[PDB]
A = this chain, B = another copy of it.
Amino acid sequence: MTPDFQIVTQRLQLRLITADEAEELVQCIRQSQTLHQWVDWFSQQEAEQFIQATRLNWVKAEAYGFGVFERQTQTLVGMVAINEFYHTFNMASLGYWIGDRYQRQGYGKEALTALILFCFERLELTRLEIVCDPENVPSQALALRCGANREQLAPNRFLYAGEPKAGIVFSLIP
């Protein structure tokens, strides 16, 4: 891991979003009918702040929030992240959000599968959890498309706007 570390697939480049890409992150949200209701943090200065925070977590090795960029055009299509490592259990927490138009092209499955393979092959983790908002069906459908298994509807399972909400837990094992 360095800030230069990328996961690259046939069509996509997974990497840190840079400070100079705040405009690109703003476009990604502004263009989506629905993302605004699921992503926590809409100003370019808010975009800048989010980018700076994500970098800090990456360099501190606490979380790896990858922007997902289309390799040909360099447009930002979404994000996939390792949100939290749980080293005691050789496990981690994943999150993601992909723009509506890019899911249609299979970018969500390509990006999230890249991250899952990195976790299992490279990091040698033996379990991953995805937590979906019960009201966000496309996010659930993507988890299932990547081979996740639904487990529980769990109370207080994740934070939105600093408050806790019931989330659906999906798992992946190698």
- Chain A positions within 8 Å of B, measured between CB atoms, are 63, 83-84, 86-91, 93, 126-127, 131, 151-152, 154-159, 164, 169, 171, 173
Q: Is the CB–CB distance between A127 and B86 below 8 Å? A: no
> Complex Cα distance A152/B167, Å?
14
B156 touches A169 (CB 8 A): no
CB pair A93–B83 under 8 Å, yes or no, is no
Name 14 A/B residue pairs within 8 A (Cβ), A-sorted.
Answer: A63-B88, A84-B87, A88-B93, A89-B131, A89-B158, A90-B164, A126-B164, A127-B164, A151-B151, A152-B152, A152-B169, A154-B171, A155-B171, A155-B173
* A154→B126 CA distance, assembly (Å): 12
**Which applies to chain A's interface (DSSP): helix, strand, loop or mixed?**
strand
The minimal Cβ–Cβ distance linking A149 to chain B, given in whole angstroms, is 8
Interface centre among A63, A87, A156 (most CB of B within 10 A): A156
